[PDB]
Amino acid sequence: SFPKYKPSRLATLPATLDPAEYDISPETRKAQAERLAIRSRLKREYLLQYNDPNRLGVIEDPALIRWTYARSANIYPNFRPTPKTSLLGALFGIGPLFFWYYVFKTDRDKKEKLIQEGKLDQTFNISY
Amino acid sequence: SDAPPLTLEAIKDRVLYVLKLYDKIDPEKLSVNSHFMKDLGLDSLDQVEIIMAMEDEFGFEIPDIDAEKLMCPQEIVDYIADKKDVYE
Amino acid sequence: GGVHIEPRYRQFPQLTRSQLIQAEFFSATMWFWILWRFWHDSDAVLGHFPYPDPSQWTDEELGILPDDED
Amino acid sequence: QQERDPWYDWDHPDLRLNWGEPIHWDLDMYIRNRVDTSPTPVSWNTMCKHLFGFVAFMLFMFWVGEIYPSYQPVGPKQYPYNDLYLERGGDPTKEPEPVVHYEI
Amino acid sequence: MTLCLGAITTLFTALCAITQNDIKKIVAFSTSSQLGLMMVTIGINQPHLAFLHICMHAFFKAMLFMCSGSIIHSLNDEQDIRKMGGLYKAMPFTTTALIIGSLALTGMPYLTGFYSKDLIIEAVNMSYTNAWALLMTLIATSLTAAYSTRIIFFAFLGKPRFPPLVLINENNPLLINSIKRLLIGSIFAGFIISNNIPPMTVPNTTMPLYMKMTALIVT
Amino acid sequence: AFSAPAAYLTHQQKVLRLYKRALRHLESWCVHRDKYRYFACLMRARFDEHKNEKDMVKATQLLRQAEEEFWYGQHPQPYIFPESPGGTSYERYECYKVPEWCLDDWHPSEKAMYPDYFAKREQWKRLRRESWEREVKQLQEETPPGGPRTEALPPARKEGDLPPLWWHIVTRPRERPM
Amino acid sequence: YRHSIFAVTHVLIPVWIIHYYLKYHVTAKPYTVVERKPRIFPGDTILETGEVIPLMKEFPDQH
Amino acid sequence: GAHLARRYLGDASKEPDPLRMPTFPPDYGFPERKEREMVATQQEMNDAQLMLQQRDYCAHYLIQLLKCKRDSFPNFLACKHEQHDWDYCEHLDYVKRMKEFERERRLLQRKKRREQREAEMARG
Amino acid sequence: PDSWDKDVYPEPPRRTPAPAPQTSLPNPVTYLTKIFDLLVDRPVTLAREFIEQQHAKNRYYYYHREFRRVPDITECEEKDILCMFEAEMQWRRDYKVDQEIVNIIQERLKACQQREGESYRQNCAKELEQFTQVSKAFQDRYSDLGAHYSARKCLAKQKQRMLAERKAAKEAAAA
Amino acid sequence: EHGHSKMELPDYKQWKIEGTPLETVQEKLAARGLRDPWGRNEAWRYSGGFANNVSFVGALLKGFKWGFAAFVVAVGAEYYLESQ
Amino acid sequence: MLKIIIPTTMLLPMTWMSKHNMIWINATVHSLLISLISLSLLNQLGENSLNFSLTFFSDSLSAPLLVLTTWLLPLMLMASQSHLSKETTTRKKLYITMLILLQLFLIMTFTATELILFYILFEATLVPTLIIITRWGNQTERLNAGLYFLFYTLAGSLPLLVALVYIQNTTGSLNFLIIHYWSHPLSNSWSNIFMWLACIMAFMVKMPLYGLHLWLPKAHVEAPIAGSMVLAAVLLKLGGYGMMRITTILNPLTNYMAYPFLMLSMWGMIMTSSICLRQTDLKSLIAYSSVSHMALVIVAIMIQTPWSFMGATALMIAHGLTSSMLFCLANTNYERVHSRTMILARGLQTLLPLMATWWLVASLTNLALPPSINLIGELFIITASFSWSNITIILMGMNMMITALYSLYMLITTQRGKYTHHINNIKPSFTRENALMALHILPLLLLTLNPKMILGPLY
Ligand SMILES: CCCCCCCC/C=C\CCCCCCCC(=O)O[C@H](COC(=O)CCCCCCC/C=C/CCCCCCCC)COP(=O)(O)OCCN
Ligand SMILES: *OP(=O)(O)OCC(C)(C)[C@@H](O)C(=O)NCCC(=O)NCCSC(=O)CCCCCCCCCCC
Structure with missing residues (x-):
């Protein structure tokens, strides 16, 4: 009996504290086998391409290209106008603008009123 | 730094020196090719304790995946020599 | 720049008497300076001027009349 | 990517990535030079609570100390020439209301 | 604001230093606490005293860091206080230099840290300040003494804990001269500077006996 | 690092790893050597109480409470070796490691210096050139259908053969190149 | 000899250049170099005028 | 502290307020009320340009100390008598301030007791 | 030095104290200033004398430019571009x-x-x-005035100020 | 010129648990029925020049004797010179 | 001004009648000579201007831009030498002809005594850039990018022309001197509001304003190196110069109408600097940095104070130089790796130390390290905005922090760390690239000695 550990988004659960690894089953073992099989196939291909004395360039990585394309050029064709996207876009693209407009307009109206009333003490304020 | 460059003679001497201080191992029966589990009758926990002793004596820690498959003093000497790039 | 000193492997390292006498000299001069300053200017630690007791003062010089005048 | 295996023989040891494996959508956010999600010896909520409590207690006690200051049993310091009027601000043509200091 | 910021900074940094295992991290939190004390001095309207503390801290903190670096280089790039043990006799010059530096840092009387830090505490005792800020300054002084004790004890007093191959060496003229110049500095410069500069603040001539010495009992 | 990882960790490997981690963190807690020896032998005794244990179910019930107890008292600032993945000098000299192919870009005036070294380099290049042609066929014949099930490579089985994919293992820059 | 050459070519020449620049060009323009006025205490004599600043009020000396 | 404890746990109005001192007339104690004397005149006390907070009633001793420190410069340990005299004058100023503080404390005590006695007499 | 005007840049007489050594210990400042003078000021002074005589060997002058007055923007017709240009340059x-x-x-x-x-x-x-x-x-x-300032905008600002001043003075006088 | 002269190792028979705090450790495990198999290996940490320890106060007072001697000599000289 | 215009035109017959192997040398030498000649325009007066003739006039706002435009062409030729090696002589001469025409159009644009001629050349600069982007572009999206870079600009510039001629029907002249001298206030009316919008949004598009900046990452990524340098250095400053020229007629309506654009530029810099933090492409990151800097310039121009104009001019010059250098460095990496991805090629300091030093200096200038002219412009704009309103300092400080963050992120991702193992075709830097970086960076550190030459007419 000890105080327990609570995982969070920025503090993930340790591997040793994951009960899922202790629920060992034959299909889990086969899944790990095929996972390491595909990893070994990729490693073998990369090592074959990497140790070649005739290759004098850059080993093009399909995964990096896929990552860059999905991040940059695959966004709009998959975009769909949904209520979530609509409200999120409207908020994050309009709200800050109107908030800053309100703040600056209030400040400048206050300053202009103070100037017109003459109670500002703008002495030595030559450079503007 | 100023550290002297160690040789495999030094590595083997230090490994055997550490193993002889292990009272669970009779100093006369131990050799550079003497296996730990069969020739010396040591458990797995004794092997991991030996690996920890080598780590403390040499100042670097061997990864566990590589550590569990070090069964002879010569294997430890060779692994350390490959790690530290020892010529002669 | 210095002299050659070899490793020892589980015994005490080789020490030159030069560093020993230098360290002892500097510790001795630190303690001598501390004692000399404590002797010559002791008011820096234990003070020089006494702290008067506020209650020890009498009512004559504190401007107090016996509760009847003003 | 900080919590990946550091002893594995990665193709990109600094990045800790392998050639051909799928790349996380947010890889450039976890690159060992930025936010890392490695487990901590203490639960995140506990550290949050402790830090917030410490900061709040310090601020509250600073406010209390401002409310209840510490000082010595002395009066205000006395300055000779009308509380040093001429050399603090100037204005010599007004003849300020004079104050004189009580010798005790 | 400056007084409160300095007080919280010095308190928190000393408290963090009180239990660190890296020597360099300990000295870093020490210098952060000293900067917090400097900011506290600024907050009580004593600028020249803060400048004097800057000048003395330069000497003794730089020499402390050089001693730590000498130890680190001696033991083959090791910084955790769990792995340097008995170095009082293994390295005598580094030991005595670090001892003198820790004494000056803690405001041992008539050293370079005395002439600044004791005046800092004396001024903070009799100013219209926060009670909390004064309390945290006193606790920071106590924690400074405590972490100096931690460094000396864990690095010089017990039995050795470094790897068997002893490579401890000190006989290099560059290191010896560089350490000794700042040793002479941290010994005598406090007195020399304090007695050479013109008086730039009103002295605290009269004090209660307990309030005059409170830094000593705290340390 | 040198050994290719297996598909999984067996129970024995997990117990050994937990034992080593517990000993290391206990050493971190117990600074002095005699106290560490006493408590480490106590840990060994408490660890071998169920060494001769029989069934896997409650043995896996164990080594699970042990993980929680270790994580509760894991010394949040453990000792780390200087060159370990958390040490103060983990990747200090990675800025000094220059690949060998850079030497091919050297000016002929630079290669006039160190001529014997470049002669040996040419010999090594020729040896790699022939050995690669042998190695590719050896790997092709040896590998099972569907590719390797593990990232473990076979050794050389003939007289003049060299281990497959050896160039970028033996030509590591150095541990401390400068 | 090395230290003599060092002091000649690393201290003397820069100080010559700086002194020439300050004394003949920087000080040519007004208000470029402004000095804090030296402190005047009772009993001091001034070189240019020669008068004597009077002493103090003869305060009662005790302890 | 003891005064802090007395003021912050006892009656607040029983103890003086440092931000409002003095709260009583200066002739309220005795009618003589001798006046403090400043030795240094404005001209010499400005020509030495000590400091704006060093310009107190102890300025003459500070002027003497500065005079020596300028005069006997290489031997920085030459003069201690003027430093001692300046410290003594500052000590005297501090004890005068403490006298003022205690005077106001006991004057407030007397005023409070007089008011309480008057209220008791009115009640009876 | 006659390089600048003493009336435009006034300076007090710069009264300085005289040395009053109360000890027989020689100071390092005097010796340092003497050796500095000997090793620095004398070579610098000699080089300056040589340079000054070289300059005096070839003497030539330069002059300050005088600008006549022109009608300003107040005496400028509404659309007369030439006088507007002249007044604008004068105003700048x-x-x-x-x-x-x-x-x-x-x-x-x-x-x-x-x-x-x-x-x-x-x-x-x-x-x-x-x-x-x-x-x-x-x-x-x-x-x-703004980034696009001109003599016309300055004139308009002055005219508005004079309107306000005249109105305030009229109100004060008739109160 | 470096440290290359073939430094020799000591003999492993030199390290004995005798005279070290490892006796206490061995006795405390023996009360429970246990032995430390690596106790001898660490004996070198208590064998040679490491056999003597200095207290914190002793370390602080590293050069107190010579300093006090010089201080009293200087004080005596000052007294004998001023009272002339 | 014909002494600069005629040699630039004569660069065309010299290019076309040169040897098959001597075109680059001739073009570089004569472009450098023309830049040396154009350096004489830096002598300005505290009074109105340098009125050469009825058609062309010069000012201390036009002179630094003209000098930079003349100076950029040799750098563009040096950068374009490499990737055009396998091109036929006719097409190389066509590329040089496009660059020469672009320089000539910019040179005639920056004098432009009349607003209609200014508009004509300002829109004429669109054709050579479009051809350069859409013809000698490596990737397939160039065509798409070209369309963007076209239509956006025209969508902003077509109304302006209308407004321009409308002004001539009401005032009778578009000559800048008469427009300045005969200026009258703009009353608050819907007609005047739309006239203001038509006169302003033409230059707000090409700056570019946040929300109208979408064409810029496309055009900068898909253009060749020389197109990128000419777009980032000079073609972005056309909007700022046009705004400075045309704001003299929009008063006092500017005070009322600046808010929608001031809000978009003040919040826009934060958004673009944040976008720079998460970018897998070097060229896109540099483009968004350019967007942030030009948003700050927009704020400065809209504030309309002398310090604002000085800061805007200095920032325009410094940003042009720094962005050109950054694009050149990224192109030197791309010519080796052929990828244009930040994370793939790493640890290049251990392989190319001098190029790493160039990267460090370029990032330091982009980070606005004092006393560089970048920081002079930024500080002047910040002070002017603080005078405008005290709350703006929050946004400016946030932008400064994020700018330093992403600049050092650029430096660390590419130069520091461990090199990519499987990349072995990283040859030592040629003398051409090193000379290009030196010629980019030395003018900046020389202009920091005489800041008054780039501070504009309000100095
Ligand atoms: C990439 C996008 C950028 C494109 C921006 C385009 C918007 C520019 C602003 C509107 C363009 C046309 C404005 C008219 C040009 C000015 C000419 C002028 O001043 O004449 C006005 C004429 O005013 C107009 O005709 C305005 C009518 C506008 C009709 C078309 C409206 C287009 C959309 C306007 C709303 C959007 C505003 C912001 C633009 C957002 C684009 C992102 C005076 O009228 P008079 O006939 O002379 O009468 C005087 C006697 N009473
Ligand atoms: O023969 P070997 O290959 O050496 O295998 C060793 C062993 C026999 C133990 C193993 O292979 C085996 O077969 N075990 C059978 C059952 C078993 O051991 N089950 C696990 C027992 S759990 C346990 O030992 C409790 C540990 C509690 C202590 C935790 C440490 C906490 C430290 C806190 C920080 C200091």
Whole structure:
């Protein structure tokens, strides 16, 4: 009996504290086998391409290209106008603008009123 | 730094020196090719304790995946020599 | 720049008497300076001027009349 | 990517990535030079609570100390020439209301 | 604001230093606490005293860091206080230099840290300040003494804990001269500077006996 | 690092790893050597109480409470070796490691210096050139259908053969190149 | 000899250049170099005028 | 502290307020009320340009100390008598301030007791 | 030095104390200043004498440019572009001159603050007042004109100020 | 010129648990029925020049004797010179 | 001004009648000579201007831009030498002809005594850039990018022309001197509001304003190196110069109408600097940095104070130089790796130390390290905005922090760390690239000695 550990988004659960690894089953073992099989196939291909004395360039990585394309050029064709996207876009693209407009307009109206009333003490304020 | 460059003679001497201080191992029966589990009758926990002793004596820690498959003093000497790039 | 000193492997390292006498000299001069300053200017630690007791003062010089005048 | 295996023989040891494996959508956010999600010896909520409590207690006690200051049993310091009027601000043509200091 | 910021900074940094295992991290939190004390001095309207503390801290903190670096280089790039043990006799010059530096840092009387830090505490005792800020300054002084004790004890007093191959060496003229110049500095410069500069603040001539010495009992 | 990882960790490997981690963190807690020896032998005794244990179910019930107890008292600032993945000098000299192919870009005036070294380099290049042609066929014949099930490579089985994919293992820059 | 050459070519020449620049060009323009006025205490004599600043009020000396 | 404890746990109005001192007339104690004397005149006390907070009633001793420190410069340990005299004058100023503080404390005590006695007499 | 005007840049007589050594211990400052003089000032002075005689061997002059006055924007027809151009250039030159006047006053104030040491708050009240008046005048003349300032905008600002002043004075007189 | 002269190792028979705090450790495990198999290996940490320890106060007072001697000599000289 | 215009035109017959192997040398030498000649325009007066003739006039706002435009062409030729090696002589001469025409159009644009001629050349600069982007572009999206870079600009510039001629029907002249001298206030009316919008949004598009900046990452990524340098250095400053020229007629309506654009530029810089933090492409990151800097310039121009104009001019010059250098460095990496991805090629300091030093200096200038002219412009704009309103300092400080963050992120991702193992075709830097970086960076550190030459007419 000890105080327990609570995982969070920025503090993930340790591997040793994951009960899922202790629920060992034959299909889990086969899944790990095929996972390491595909990893070994990729490693073998990369090592074959990497140790070649005739290759004098850059080993093009399909995964990096896929990552860059999905991040940059695959966004709009998959975009769909949904209520979530609509409200999120409207908020994050309009709200800050109107908030800053309100703040600056209030400040400048206050300053202009103070100037017109003459109670500002703008002495030595030559450079503007 | 100023550290002297160690040789495999030094590595083997230090490994055997550490193993002889292990009272669970009779100093006369131990050799550079003497296996730990069969020739010396040591458990797995004794092997991991030996690996920890080598780590403390040499100042670097061997990864566990590589550590569990070090069964002879010569294997430890060779692994350390490959790690530290020892010529002669 | 210095002299050659070899490793020892589980015994005490080789020490030159030069560093020993230098360290002892500097510790001795630190303690001598501390004692000399404590002797010559002791008011820096234990003070020089006494702290008067506020209650020890009498009512004559504190401007107090016996509760009847003003 | 900080919590990946550091002893594995990665193709990109600094990045800790392998050639051909799928790349996380947010890889450039976890690159060992930025936010890392490695487990901590203490639960995140506990550290949050402790830090917030410490900061709040310090601020509250600073406010209390401002409310209840510490000082010595002395009066205000006395300055000779009308509380040093001429050399603090100037204005010599007004003849300020004079104050004189009580010798005790 | 400056007084409160300095007080919280010095308190928190000393408290963090009180239990660190890296020597360099300990000295870093020490210098952060000293900067917090400097900011506290600024907050009580004593600028020249803060400048004097800057000048003395330069000497003794730089020499402390050089001693730590000498130890680190001696033991083959090791910084955790769990792995340097008995170095009082293994390295005598580094030991005595670090001892003198820790004494000056803690405001041992008539050293370079005395002439600044004791005046800092004396001024903070009799100013219209926060009670909390004064309390945290006193606790920071106590924690400074405590972490100096931690460094000396864990690095010089017990039995050795470094790897068997002893490579401890000190006989290099560059290191010896560089350490000794700042040793002479941290010994005598406090007195020399304090007695050479013109008086730039009103002295605290009269004090209660307990309030005059409170830094000593705290340390 | 040198050994290719297996598909999984067996129970024995997990117990050994937990034992080593517990000993290391206990050493971190117990600074002095005699106290560490006493408590480490106590840990060994408490660890071998169920060494001769029989069934896997409650043995896996164990080594699970042990993980929680270790994580509760894991010394949040453990000792780390200087060159370990958390040490103060983990990747200090990675800025000094220059690949060998850079030497091919050297000016002929630079290669006039160190001529014997470049002669040996040419010999090594020729040896790699022939050995690669042998190695590719050896790997092709040896590998099972569907590719390797593990990232473990076979050794050389003939007289003049060299281990497959050896160039970028033996030509590591150095541990401390400068 | 090395230290003599060092002091000649690393201290003397820069100080010559700086002194020439300050004394003949920087000080040519007004208000470029402004000095804090030296402190005047009772009993001091001034070189240019020669008068004597009077002493103090003869305060009662005790302890 | 003891005064802090007395003021912050006892009656607040029983103890003086440092931000409002003095709260009583200066002739309220005795009618003589001798006046403090400043030795240094404005001209010499400005020509030495000590400091704006060093310009107190102890300025003459500070002027003497500065005079020596300028005069006997290489031997920085030459003069201690003027430093001692300046410290003594500052000590005297501090004890005068403490006298003022205690005077106001006991004057407030007397005023409070007089008011309480008057209220008791009115009640009876 | 006659390189600048003493009336434009006033300086106090610079009274300095005389040495009054109370000890027989020789100071290092005097010896250091003597050796510095001997090794630095003499070679520098000789080089300057050589350079000055070389300059005196070949003497030639340069002159300050004088600008005549022209009709300003107030006496300028509404659409007469030529007189508007002349008045505009005159106004820009006057603006530059006023900027340099403010610069001179600011330099006076800075020199006063540095020279007076610790009694600057009292001994620089005259310079502070002078700078206050000059800054007030400059702010009235040229502030709030904008990036595209012109003589017409300055004239309009002045006219608005005079309207306000006249209205206020009329109200005060008839109250 | 470096440290290359073939430094020799000591003999492993030199390290004995005798005279070290490892006796206490061995006795405390023996009360429970246990032995430390690596106790001898660490004996070198208590064998040679490491056999003596200095207290914190002793370390602080590293050069107190010579300093006090010089201080009293200087004080005596000052007294004998001023009272002339 | 014909002494600069005629040699630039004569560069065309010299290019076309040169040897098959001597075109680059001739073009570089004569472009450098023309830049040396154009350096004489830096002598300005505190009075109105340098009125050469009825058609062309010069000012201390036009002179630095003209000098930079003349100076950029030799750098563009040096950068374009490499990737055009396998091109036929006719097409190389066509590329040089496009660059020469672009320089000529910019040179005639920056004098432009009349607003209609300014508009004509300002829109004429669109054709050579479009051809350069859409013809000698490596990737397939160039065509798409070209369309963007076209239509956006025209969508902003077509109304302006209308407004321009409308002004001539009401005032009778578009000559800048008469427009300045005969200026009258703009009353608050819907007609005047739309006239203001038509006169402003033409230059707000090409700056570019946040929300109208979408064409810029596309055009900068898909253009060749020389197109990128000419787009980032000079073609972005056309909007700022046009705004400075045309704001003299929009008063006092500018004070009322600046808010929608001030809000978009003040919040826009934060958004673009944040976008720079998460970018897998070097060229896109540099483009968004350009967007942030030009948003700050927009704020400065809209504030309309002398310090604002000085800061805007200095920032325009410094940003042009720094962005050109950054694009050149990224192109030197791309010519080796052929990828244009930040994370793939790493640890290049250990392989190319001098190029790493160039990267460090370029990032330091982009980070606005004092006393560089970048920081002079930024500080002047910040002070002017603080005078405008005291709350703006929050946004400016946030932008400064994020700018330093992403600049050092650029430096660390590419130069520091461990090199990519499987990349072995990283040859030592040629003398051409090193000379290109030196010629980019030395003018910046020389202009920091005489800041008054790039501070504009309000100095
Ligand atoms: C990439 C996108 C950028 C494109 C921006 C385009 C918007 C520019 C602003 C509107 C363009 C046309 C404005 C008219 C040009 C000015 C000419 C002028 O001043 O004449 C006006 C004419 O005013 C107009 O005709 C305005 C009518 C506008 C009709 C078309 C409206 C287009 C959309 C306007 C709303 C959007 C505003 C912001 C633009 C957002 C684009 C992102 C005066 O009328 P008079 O006939 O002379 O009468 C005087 C006697 N009473
Ligand atoms: O023969 P070997 O290959 O050496 O295998 C060793 C062993 C026999 C133990 C193993 O292979 C085996 O077969 N075990 C059978 C059952 C078993 O051991 N089950 C696990 C027992 S759990 C346990 O030992 C409790 C540990 C509690 C202590 C935790 C440490 C906490 C430290 C806190 C920080 C200091």
